[PDB]
Design a protein around this nucleic acid. Structure first.
Length: 1146
RNA sequence: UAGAAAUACGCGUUUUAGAGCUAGAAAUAGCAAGUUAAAAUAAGGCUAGUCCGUUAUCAACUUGAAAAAGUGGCACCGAGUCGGUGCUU
DNA sequence: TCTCTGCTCTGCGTATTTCT
DNA sequence: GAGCAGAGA
């Protein structure tokens, strides 16, 4: 009557089993609903549930951020058009309308087809004058003529739209650091400051480090050659410590700045008051040469002086492209005239036409064309340009990502400065346009929502619409940054209503420095028994040792106190340098407010906003130091548990006990685990949907699906056996490779989940009556149990192994707890306060109680019988598919009606569009369709695919949507929603899973008997066993006596494939390759048949390789066959079905 | 060592614009040119925000707007995917 | 005109921050 | 899985 549930949770499967107390699996007749004639079906209580893996939110978040990026870029262009509109409406009123209409075909445009000037002659004159946009940008930067307003708009919009990166914090400017000649300013500044004053010996300047990856080994000898080595560090030539940041905060070379500790390049190069700016410019030349090195990595050489180096570089790139194109065309005309057509006309060969007009990248084009250049001659400069990857480049490439926004800002500022005198409105709001260019939303403000986003946290000061200009006076930056941090910090596990402290909080140090010291003992000559440190002794070691050394260290613990962390305290005592104000605890709440602020915020002026209320306590220079100190890391527990929770025994919260208990020292965990002290019931009093009850819990997104499916499997399995509760549930835990780590995460909470949902009734004497022992096992035990008693799994044949593993889980679990009852508290979850050889006398018992726990003999027979069962409930979970509407690439225009439009008014016979849509779920319809030249209603019944785009419009009103598809007189009740992997049964018990509206999938399972899978495991692993010798030699002799098993395996494959797979050509190719290869050795034959079971695999058809050939898979490319089949509606365990005979409809 | 969120960048794809010329009933053939720009980048939605739109959830049936709740007898002998036999309403 | 066989097609590279 | 074209009716 009693039973036990075995489970096996994976990333794609949940195997379940139900055993009775003699390890037999029961079977029952289950009721069949539906209009079929079969009314009751016998089923075994063992099976598995397979599903697609759950996906992370990663791709969704990336596409959401991309959506917001494109929205904000379009808003930038709209702001710029708003600024320009009033004046631009006097020279070309339809201009912005033409730019909007530019995508449309010649007929769909309302205005003339030439966007910029609106006629052919001015447009072609413009394109001959400025071949690229960069010619126009350089012309507007350099020339001083009054330009046409439209060209100004194109230039400004081209910088505002494609504005480059923001990774450089400073004021990067290519108006002083164009060329690498900074030696004169650097050396003259050095010799103006210093006395002995060496002089230049090599002018290589930045081009030394330009040629290599950064290292001391590059720059040391080069700076010695540049400048003779009077000062091996601090020569103040171009050197790595001044050019490039140092990650450790090592002291400076010389006491010009008190040996200031070095940092990376940041805003801290503007403020260095503590050691440099208040005590001592060389560093102006240093940052100038940093500008020099980085621009020389990104900007080519400029011999002409100009305010637009990037546009000049792009013009140079264009001109060299033109010259090498002309030279290459002449060379190919002269020496290889037959290749000219292939190179310059054929746009599918990765030639020049395929690189410009086709889809070949620069790398592919170079790889194609380089043998052509090498076999020719006169190509030397082209070959070396190709070797430097600077042959026939394009102005817009993958390498433009290194360009910082300061260069575009300089060019835009130069254009506005030149052209402001002719257009007054350009001068009136130059700051507005620059603000449009340079504004970013801060990463701590997040989306600028109005309470309709589930991601936003922004708090706005005023009901105004946010814009780049009014941003500062509309968003409360302080509150928004605080909310940006506070939403991520987690509550403590003991009281989920108070925010935890920073790790550098002083109260957390009065936890920390005495918590470890509480359970340390001092054992010496002074007494005969070990004693904990007294509170007075703890205070003494703190005051002497820990108040001079941050880190606990047992060597100095010995040789400091007994022969005679506080890092925040030490730093704050080397800043304020007053021990009184730190030892003062009366004022400590304001000090924790300071600690909280320096933990929350990193942008410095926000630090000033939080510190304004404390200016009266301290002088200004130490607030400037406070800007430079930053705290990271958060504490593990809350302020109420720190101090607030007064006890009823001593007036001593935990940290008061850690400070001073004298003897009988009690640690944090013992104090909170104690109930006789009034902390445990406080934790108890401190404490309606399973979905939320797992949502905020930790876990990989894949495994959480498996856990929820496991819980629903347990619920339905309990429901199946008439609400009688189990007494054991066995769970996978491979704790001490993604599978290993994901299965180790599982048992942090699944045992809690099952124990909470299972055990729910209690009494007054005990607050839970333990009725289900939640067993938990490691896969190692089931592994040697499999490999030690000839029950081998092979994963390639069938999905029964999941259920088989579940069965093994249950049997070894129950047989272990019955064998060692006293070891419940090691494995049973719910009650704990902190081997395998007995399976190998024939009858084993607990002994302390005479119950039989294992019977070598009938038990192994029962297990063999269960593994040899043919019927195992495999159920593929039907899911409505969700995700992207279609594949992402935009196919060119075609005269096909399968192209999906990109927009409402973009007919995809003129504009192209997407292909390969994804069906959410198919829908069986039965209606009349007007087929035939003579329009007359033939009744039809066919499947239809409802794609993800059409899903909402279908569920809004199915009848109108189907009538729009052409169907007439749709039988509304007869509409059947069929998700993916909907299961159908056909003749001879041949099942098919519906992969889509127009494709099927294989559905049956080859239930190969246990002797053959044992043989195949013993064969395919032929000389890789590494066990006891005589055992593997008798296994060798066993596989040697049984070669005929191979031939009967092939008959099984032929029979199953002739019954269910219906792939004739695949079958006799397999048979012919077998018959022509029957003489090969056993290992290769058995391994190739193990690949050969892919023919009979559940799921999609897939190609597979034999000894000498790959056999193409037979795809089932139509669903006409299932419209007269038995559709099966399987429950989650698959025991409850609902068969619909579709042939009786319409 | 990974999950989850935010702010940005560079490409890519698509259609249009960048007058192709000559010899020709041409099917065409010779020759020149090629680097750039606009717009879109899930269709779209309404609370109209510089917001949201690809994560999670989901067998069937009966109630319920929804949330949700409920609905399927047992033992034994066998096993080609479950079959048979015997009690019970 | 409506179903089968055989072969081809498929968005990408980076950053800065967070919290766990 | 879908797409596409090229044959069997």
């Amino acid at each position: 009557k009693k039973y036990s549930i075995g489970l096996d949770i994976g990333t794609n499967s949940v195997g379940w089993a139900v055993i009775t107390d003699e390890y037999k699996v029961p079977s029952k007749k289950f009721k069949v609903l539906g209009n079929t004639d079969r009314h009751s079906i016998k089923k075994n209580l063992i099976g598995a549930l397979l599903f697609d893996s759950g996906e992370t939110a990663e791709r969704t978040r990336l596409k959401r951020t991309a959506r917001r990026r494109y929205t904000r870029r379009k808003n930038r262009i709209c702001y710029l058009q708003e600024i320009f509109s009033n004046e631009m409406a006097k020279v070309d009123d339809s201009f912005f309308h033409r730019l909007e209409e530019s995508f449309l075909v010649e007929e769909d445009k309302k205005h003339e087809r030439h966007p910029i000037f609106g006629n052919i002659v001015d447009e072609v004159a413009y394109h001959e004058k400025y071949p690229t946009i960069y010619h126009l940008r350089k012309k507007l930067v350099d020339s001083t003529d009054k330009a046409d307003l439209r060209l100004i708009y194109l230039a400004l919009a081209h910088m505002i739209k494609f504005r480059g990166h923001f990774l450089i914090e400073g004021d990067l400017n290519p108006d002083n650091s164009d060329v690498d000649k900074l030696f004169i300013q650097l050396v003259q500044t050095y010799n103006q400051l210093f006395e002995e004053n060496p002089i230049n010996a090599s002018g290589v300047d930045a081009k030394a480090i330009l040629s290599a990856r950064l290292s001391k080994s590059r720059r040391l000898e080069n700076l010695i050659a540049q400048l003779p080595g009077e000062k091996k560090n601090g020569l103040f030539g171009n050197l790595i410590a001044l050019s490039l940041g140092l990650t450790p905060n090592f002291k400076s070379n010389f006491d010009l700045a008190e040996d200031a500790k070095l940092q990376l390049s940041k805003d801290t190069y503007d403020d260095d008051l503590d050691n440099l700016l208040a005590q001592i410019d060389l560093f102006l030349a240093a940052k100038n040469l940093s500008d020099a090195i980085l621009l020389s990595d990104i900007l080519r050489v400029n011999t002409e002086i100009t305010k637009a180096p990037l546009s000049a570089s792009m013009i140079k790139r264009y001109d060299e492209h033109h010259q090498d194109l002309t030279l290459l065309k002449a060379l190919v005309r002269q020496q290889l005239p037959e290749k000219y057509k292939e190179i310059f006309f054929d746009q599918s060969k990765n030639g020049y036409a395929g690189y410009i007009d086709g889809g070949a990248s620069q790398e592919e084009f170079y790889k194609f064309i380089k043998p052509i250049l090498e076999k020719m001659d006169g190509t030397e400069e082209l070959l070396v340009k190709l070797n430097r990857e600077d042959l026939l480049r394009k102005q817009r490439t993958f390498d433009n990502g290194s360009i910082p926004h300061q260069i575009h800002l300089g060019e835009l500022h130069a254009i506005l400065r030149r052209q402001e005198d002719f257009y007054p409105f350009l001068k009136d709001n130059r700051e507005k346009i620059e603000k449009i260019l340079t504004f970013r939303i801060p990463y701590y403000v997040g989306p600028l929502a109005r309470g309709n986003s589930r991601f936003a946290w922004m708090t706005r000061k005023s009901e105004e619409t946010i814009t780049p200009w009014n941003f500062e006076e509309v968003v409360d930056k302080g509150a928004s940054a605080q909310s940006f941090i506070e939403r991520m910090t987690n509550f403590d596990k003991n009281l989920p209503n108070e925010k935890v402290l920073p790790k550098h909080s002083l109260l957390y140090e009065y936890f920390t420095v005495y918590n470890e010291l509480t359970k340390v003992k001092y054992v010496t000559e002074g007494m005969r028994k070990p004693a904990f440190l007294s509170g007075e002794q703890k205070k003494a070691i703190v005051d002497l040792l820990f108040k001079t050394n941050r880190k606990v260290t047992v060597k100095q613990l010995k040789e400091d106190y007994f022969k005679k962390s506080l890092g925040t305290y030490h730093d704050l005592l080397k800043i304020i340098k007053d021990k009184d104000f730190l030892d003062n605890e009366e004022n400590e709440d304001i000090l924790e407010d300071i600690v909280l602020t320096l933990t929350l915020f990193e942008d410095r002026e926000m630090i000033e906003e939080r510190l304004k209320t404390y200016a009266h306590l301290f002088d200004d220079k130490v607030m400037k130091q406070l800007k430079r100190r930053r705290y990271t890391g958060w504490g593990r527990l809350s302020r109420k548990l720190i101090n607030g929770i007064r006890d009823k025994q001593s007036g001593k919260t935990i940290l008061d006990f850690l400070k001073s208990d004298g003897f009988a020292n009690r640690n944090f965990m013992q104090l909170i685990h104690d109930d006789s002290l009034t902390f445990k019931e406080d934790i108890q009093k401190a404490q309606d949907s399973l979905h939320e009850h797992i949502a905020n819990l930790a876990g990989s997104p894949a495994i959480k699906k498996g856990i929820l499916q496991t819980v629903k499997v347990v619920d339905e399995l309990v429901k199946v056996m008439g609400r009688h509760k189990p007494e054991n549930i066995v769970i996978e835990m491979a704790r001490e490779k993604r599978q290993l780590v994901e299965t180790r995460q599982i048992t942090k909470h699944v045992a809690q989940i099952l124990d909470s949902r299972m055990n729910t009734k209690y009494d007054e004497n005990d607050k839970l009556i333990r009725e289900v022992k939640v067993i938990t096992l490691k896969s190692k035990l089931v592994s040697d149990f499999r490999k030690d008693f000839q029950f081998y799994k092979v994963r390639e044949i069938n999905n029964y192994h999941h259920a088989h593993d579940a069965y093994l889980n249950a049997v070894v679990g129950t047989a272990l707890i019955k064998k060692y009852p006293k070891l419940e508290s090691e494995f049973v979850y719910g009650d704990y306060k902190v081997i395998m050889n007995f399976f190998k006398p024939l009858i084993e018992t607990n002994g302390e109680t005479g119950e039989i726990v294992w019977d070598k003999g009938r038990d192994f027979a029962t297990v063999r019988k269960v593994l040899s069962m043919p019927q195992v409930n495999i159920v593929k979970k039907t899911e409505v598919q969700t995700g992207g509407f279609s594949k992402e690439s935009i196919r060119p225009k075609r005269n096909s009606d399968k192209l999906i439009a990109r927009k409402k008014d973009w007919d995809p016979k003129k504009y192209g569009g997407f292909l390969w849509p994804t069906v959410a779920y198919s829908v069986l319809v039965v209606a009349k369709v007007e087929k035939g030249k003579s329009k007359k209603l033939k009744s039809v019944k066919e499947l239809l695919g409802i794609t993800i785009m059409e899903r909402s419009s279908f569920e809004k009103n199915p009848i109108d949507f189907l009538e729009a598809k052409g169907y007439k007189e749709v039988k509304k009740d007869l509409i059947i929603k069929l998700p993916k992997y909907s299961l159908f049964e056909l003749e001879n018990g041949r099942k098919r899973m519906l992969a889509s509206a127009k494709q099927l999938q294989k559905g049956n399972e080859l239930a190969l008997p246990s002797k053959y899978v044992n043989f195949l495991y013993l064969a395919s692993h032929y000389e890789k066993l590494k066990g006891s010798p005589e055992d593997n030699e008798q296994k060798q002799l066993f596989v040697e006596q049984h070669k005929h098993y191979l031939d009967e395996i092939i008959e099984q494959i032929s029979e199953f494939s002739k019954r269910v797979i219906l792939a004739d050509a695949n079958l006799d190719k397999v048979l012919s390759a077998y018959n022509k290869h029957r003489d090969k050795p056993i290992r290769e034959q058995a391994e190739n048949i193990i690949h050969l079971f892919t023919l009979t695999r559940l799921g999609a058809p897939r190609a597979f390789k034999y000894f000498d050939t790959t056999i193409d898979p037979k795809q089932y490319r139509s669903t006409k066959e299932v419209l007269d089949a038995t559709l099966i509606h399987q429950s989650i365990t698959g025991l409850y079905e609902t068969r619909i005979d579709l042939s009786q409809l319409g």
